[PDB]
RNA sequence: UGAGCCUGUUUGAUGUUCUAACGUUGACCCGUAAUCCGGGUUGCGGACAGUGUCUGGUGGGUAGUUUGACUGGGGCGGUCU
RNA sequence: AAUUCCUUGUCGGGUAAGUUCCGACCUGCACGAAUGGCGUAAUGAUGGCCAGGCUGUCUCCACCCGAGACUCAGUGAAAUU
RNA sequence: GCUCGCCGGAAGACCAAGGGUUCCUGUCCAACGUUAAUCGGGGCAGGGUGAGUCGACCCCUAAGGCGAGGCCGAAAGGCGUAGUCGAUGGGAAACAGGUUAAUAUUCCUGUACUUGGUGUUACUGCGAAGGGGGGACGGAGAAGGCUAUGUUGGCCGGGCGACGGUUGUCCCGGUUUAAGCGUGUAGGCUGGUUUUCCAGGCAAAUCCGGAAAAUCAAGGCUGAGGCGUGAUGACGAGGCACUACGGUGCUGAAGCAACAAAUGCCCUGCUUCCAGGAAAAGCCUCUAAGCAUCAGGUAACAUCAAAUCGUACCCCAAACCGACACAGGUGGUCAGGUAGAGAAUACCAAGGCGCUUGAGAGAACUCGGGUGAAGGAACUAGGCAAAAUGGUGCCGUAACUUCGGGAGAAGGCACGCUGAUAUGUAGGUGAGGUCCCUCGCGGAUGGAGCUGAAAUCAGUCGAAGAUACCAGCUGGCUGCAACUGUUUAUUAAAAACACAGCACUGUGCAAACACGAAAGUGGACGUAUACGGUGUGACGCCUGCCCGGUGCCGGAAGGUUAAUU
RNA sequence: AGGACCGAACCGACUAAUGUUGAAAAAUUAGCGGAUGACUUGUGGCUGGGGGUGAAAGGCCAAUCAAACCGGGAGAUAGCU
């Protein structure tokens, strides 16, 4: 049967990437929260 | 002509076609074509704004001349053509100086005919004159509303307008809807009436024909739930209420015109 | 043509004319290598249209809520001083 | 009658025997003309009824061919208390 | 190592997406592998990916995103011009053979090709952010020419058979060769050349467009295949001497014709139909500012450069999505033999596999199958399930009908093998020879060789000749919806939704209407034969009375009535 | 010529049996419908929660829909066990 997850690198990067987050005001708040928590990986950029 | 199809299949029983053995069988003039992309009824916000639109056949746009402001140089008709963007045929005309253009096709016009425009052109079909220079009681088509803007009235298949009177600097016209209107006397119009008067005798015959032209199904409001339409609900077939639109306004009689800037140009509403 | 006031004085009502506020999703020129925008000239309207404050009408399109107790189960019937 | 409670209404045909099916009658509890009335060739993994051929559906069950169930060696759960 | 079984339009071969060392070699069996393990996609160590021509990067745009100035909004922000990004699309160039434990159009051998810079010679009007050409485009159908590929002959090398025969009309194996360069064929499209004039292509133009004369009738573009060279090369069964059993070095026969033939190529072609079938750059041409000794442009030589990133392995699956070494899901390319209409089905070739617990015995009961005396729906809510029909050719076929249908209605008859007509028939393909020719991939005649249906008559075997897999059950009377379609992913596929047709009503263009505090946008680059809302639902005959109640449309004489004064 | 006819690849889901701590949190076996069209499929893009899309079933919006998921008001209130 067909399942929910179907990978694609281009779509992943265009959706949840560093530059996508930086392009708007709320992605920068997401980045600030994650930096405050102290995460090792900040985005999905590999 | 109008031709019936034979009942060789259930989808061909009720089809009537219009056939004209005079249109071009070939490619249109290329220097007068542009691109035309579809929308589906969506606007710049991405929302459906007009319902029941989507799909169809790919089409290209033909640049047609509605102004007719190249005066003093006669032309000759070359061929009649097909245009998928309107309900009337078009014609390709050549000018004595070596230029081509597109225009609407009047009734009774064939290849090899002369046309002209200006304040000193003959009164015969296909010519363009100001209505200051057209006799009262004439039949015209492709009429302007302001001087120098372009034709906006009587542009469909088999349509025309009458000049009924004249006074001062205005003219009075009767429209296909039964309404009387005033326009300035410097506006332009073309003699005759539009062609293809048999466009209303065709029967599509099946739903695929409607799909081919870009029309999607319409869903009745009495077959819905009371959360989608003011008409939905019931244990069976129940209406018990006054008909209304999907947004609450009453259809079947209520009026919707409100424009005080233009009411000075109406002499009697359509009857 | 309705009120004062003696044809003279100022405010009202209906109407015809006008241009200078205001409108132009009419035509031409420039910024410019541009169907946005701004300026210039010129036609068409014109104190109408449209906007702000206040005010009468309509408004299940939308929202917050109500729709009592006794009872040989509850409802219908009956009762509540 | 996709509509008729009394109801398996009364008459005719099909069966040895037919509350279902077909044709009529009119007493329409409570049909009816674009929330349409009466007909209609062809199409339907649509509802009801009748025939020919076919048969283990049945009177009424018998035998055979394979995979488990049983014994030996290896690994090794579960709900519940 | 020998025998046995299974797939073979796949359970074989190569990729894109996704994964990232799972690839080869040595060593180890604690944990992992539904059992043991000397084994592994498991632990530890080393090795392995070689590009001017393959991709990416690069030049150009589509849907769409961002957006200097600008317009709009309490703030945050929204929409858009000039521009700038964005492939699933357009744009230069390579073939065959050999090699490693693991790479190959990249390494080696042989023969090729494309784009830029510099320099020397010879001639010369060059120049764009502009004009024109081309790139450049739909569905269905048909038949002519070819190739990939297969079969049979001929040629070469080998055999004379475990049990009757096998020196022959006998058995086995091979018979392969590319890109590039030259010739321009089957066929497709288009009249050629020269001179004069002009309100058009935002300015100009020798370019495009329009008009008028004279002359010649054959000039030009496109194009599969075949043929020559590449090739005195490479490859090739076998043989000659050594073996750590993986090989080394040399030698090396024949290497032709006929027939059949594609869903692949000519073909972006031809015919026909209506629903009328992308954009920009690379490329070819014309000129403006400007330079005219120069710069630049065209041709022949010598020379330099072509950078950087990917390249292992799996890819219908034990390596991707499903918590698992899970009976599920996943786009593209390749297409042998016999029987067959066939990419269906049966047995095989190249190739790959026997699915990670076994050994016995032959109770009841459960699951999947074969056969059954007499009867033939008596079973059951109901013929649920099972049983049955099933091909080609020809006879022959009702009520009703919108004249197309119903119809494959229903019901019948023939079907294997051998011989003759005819030592291979009708048809298809087609060499040698003889003539003509504007001399060539030519034209006419001729029939050697190869291939090959269907029919009639006469004999013969079995119970059965459409013998296996494959392959419609048929008729009669009634309710509903006219028809093909759509629907509750995961208990409802229908009489429910849609549909072509009919009617009422709104809308004069800055249109009604809808998304938006607004700017703006769709309706539509449309204009009453157009567009929005509402009800009915092919077609035939039809659609009767009521305006008291609630809505909607018109009227303005009277009565009541807000802010303001 | 055809929203024509029989039928594989491809797209679906009408009947029966097995399975129900399943090989599988929707499958397998034998039959079944469409198959040149209102057809099917690869890559990318747009529509955001009182909102979207819907040939209309209260259908779908990441195994969740008569108002999605996550973090806050928050130790909401609970004459109830």
XYZ file of C-alpha atoms (C1' of nucleotides) in Angstrom, chain F residues 20-50:
31
model
C -9.252 -11.727 12.822
C -2.928 -12.185 19.617
C -3.106 -12.038 10.553
C 2.249 -12.939 5.835
C -0.700 -7.538 6.074
C -3.344 -1.408 11.813
C -7.844 -3.171 5.059
C -4.500 -8.451 2.428
C -4.564 -13.453 -0.486
C -7.186 -17.103 -3.857
C -11.297 -18.004 -7.853
C -14.649 -15.310 -10.572
C -15.924 -9.461 -12.106
C -16.220 -3.519 -14.784
C -13.605 0.245 -18.295
C -9.843 -0.255 -21.764
C -9.154 6.589 -28.111
C -11.479 8.694 -23.836
C -15.723 13.321 -19.091
C -9.004 8.319 -20.145
C -4.418 7.243 -17.392
C 0.705 8.514 -15.651
C 6.279 11.202 -14.144
C 8.374 16.371 -12.432
C 7.371 21.033 -10.489
C 3.757 25.025 -8.794
C -1.124 27.599 -6.092
C -5.293 27.436 -2.556
C -4.584 27.450 5.302
C -8.677 26.192 9.909
C -14.999 29.135 11.244
